[PDB]
Design a protein around this ligand. Structure first.
Ligand code: VO4
Length: 297
């Protein structure tokens, strides 16, 4: 029972030692492509790279590299693409990946400006009447509508392949009050946001993997994916005790380094999963309580 593991960890004040245990047990795979000199300007952080075995390949011939990893959780039956905040020169790469991987949703967990600095490019149009065209990858992107809440915003985007003129609708879920190296305000407001992503169809198996990013694509992105997979696994049987959150994290770091970046984020994940167990185990009323507790209006 992760409730007992949680209480035992809290009581001994062992969150930092436990978190360092995961870091030292974590997979270590080569990132040879990411480090090729020609890819220097494609990485936002020197110390954050996708493993070669799980990196997302662009379907282009010039250079197929992007800082993005496929997290394939076989037992949970869910896939995610975790990526960094697009750079001014990789916004076309980012949308090409979205197109080629057939994703329906993009979860953005950071602000463009955080802590006084630019953590991500403005890679989607802020105004309906000012579409964006990415000429390197021949893609058109239009803001179709926005639904602005108090701590997150949902956008409907139209992505057009300017070569084939096929169009796709993309849902953008922008969490705007989750600080870098930090935790959400509350389990309830994190879960409320997670379930709004789930309710959108963006995580259906009829779609390509949802794209999840923050600035580096590891810390907040890791927290979001870990909690989601844990709740899905618990959903599959109806057996909370079946879910080893630390083993799930380690399995995830087989596909991308550094997932979950502080010990308080690991502790938050437990709380989110424990609270989320109420809904998975039969209490649907808890969804509306999260929404109310979130003050999203
Ligand atoms: O932009 V993150 O530091 O939460 O990987």
């Amino acid at each position: 029972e992760m409730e007992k593991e949680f209480e035992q960890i809290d009581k001994s004040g062992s969150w930092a030692a436990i978190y360092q245990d995961i870091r030292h047990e974590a997979s270590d795979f080569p990132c040879r492509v990411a480090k090729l000199p020609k890819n220097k300007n494609r990485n936002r952080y020197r110390d954050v790279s996708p493993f070669d075995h799980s990196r997302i390949k662009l379907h282009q011939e010039d250079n197929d590299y992007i800082n993005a990893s496929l997290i394939k959780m076989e037992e949970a039956q869910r896939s995610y693409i975790l990526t960094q905040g697009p750079l001014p020169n990789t916004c076309g790469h980012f949308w090409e990946m979205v197109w080629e991987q057939k994703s329906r949703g993009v979860v953005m967990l950071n602000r463009v400006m955080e802590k006084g600095s630019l953590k991500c490019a403005q890679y989607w149009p802020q105004k309906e009447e000012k579409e964006m065209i990415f000429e390197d990858t021949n893609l058109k992107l239009t803001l179709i509508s926005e639904d602005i809440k108090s701590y997150y915003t949902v956008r409907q985007l139209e992505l057009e392949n300017l070569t084939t003129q096929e169009t796709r609708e993309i849902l953008h879920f922008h969490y705007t009050t989750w600080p870098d190296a930090g935790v959400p305000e509350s389990p309830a407001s994190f879960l409320n946001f997670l379930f709004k992503v789930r309710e959108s169809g963006s995580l259906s198996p009829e779609h390509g993997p949802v794209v999840v990013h923050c600035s580096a694509g590891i810390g907040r992105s890791g927290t979001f994916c870990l909690a989601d997979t844990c709740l899905l696994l618990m959903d599959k049987r109806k057996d909370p005790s079946s879910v080893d959150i630390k083993k799930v994290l380690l399995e995830m770091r087989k596909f991308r380094m550094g997932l979950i970046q502080t010990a308080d984020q690991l502790r938050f994940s437990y709380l989110a999963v424990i609270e989320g167990a109420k809904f998975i185990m039969g209490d649907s009323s808890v969804q509306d309580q999260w929404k109310e507790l979130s003050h999203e209006d």
